[PDB]
């Protein structure tokens, strides 16, 4: 079953969107 679980297991733009989500999270504590 572990073998099977492992089987099912087997950038700049992102950095920008990620900072955006960071700010969103801060606010929540429109994407």
């Amino acid at each position: 079953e572990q073998v099977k679980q492992r089987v099912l297991h087997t950038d700049n733009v992102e950095m920008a969107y990620a900072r955006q989500m960071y700010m969103y999270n801060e606010k929540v504590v429109s994407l």
């Binding site: 073998v3 099977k4 089987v7 099912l8």
Partner: protein, 126 residues
């Protein structure tokens, strides 16, 4: 085959037959027969699951070894590999795998993982 057949014989449990039926293990005879047949049922279930494992593992091992041995072996070997590989995993093998996975796997695993591994083995093979 022996498994489905033993299962049938068990579900149809009811001297030569009684002698050969106790020989690998009327009321005590019937009980002994239920015992031996359930024992063989378990042995078959175990050889079967062990099969499933051997197959799935061998698939993983071959996949990784081949990806490394053709995609990343700095050089005949990779070419002969593609050749003997399209040769060995002829459709007989793959259809056998899918036939089995339909025969037994649907009743023990929610995932026809063998189907997926077959797909990917083909996709790296072609």
């Amino acid at each position: 085959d022996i498994h489905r057949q033993s299962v049938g014989k068990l579900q149809n449990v009811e001297p030569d037959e009684i002698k050969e039926l106790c020989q690998s293990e009327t009321t005590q005879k019937y009980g002994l027969a239920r015992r031996r047949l359930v024992k063989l049922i378990n042995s078959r279930a175990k050889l079967l699951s062990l099969c499933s494992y051997i197959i799935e593992t061998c698939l993983y091992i071959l996949w990784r070894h081949l990806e490394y041995y053709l995609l990343h072996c700095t050089t005949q070997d990779v070419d002969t590999l593609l050749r003997e590989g399209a040769n060995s995993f002829g459709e007989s093998l793959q259809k056998r795998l899918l036939d089995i996975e339909s025969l037994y796997c649907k009743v023990r695993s929610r995932h026809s993982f063998i189907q997926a591994l077959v797909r990917r083995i083909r996709g790296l093979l072609r």
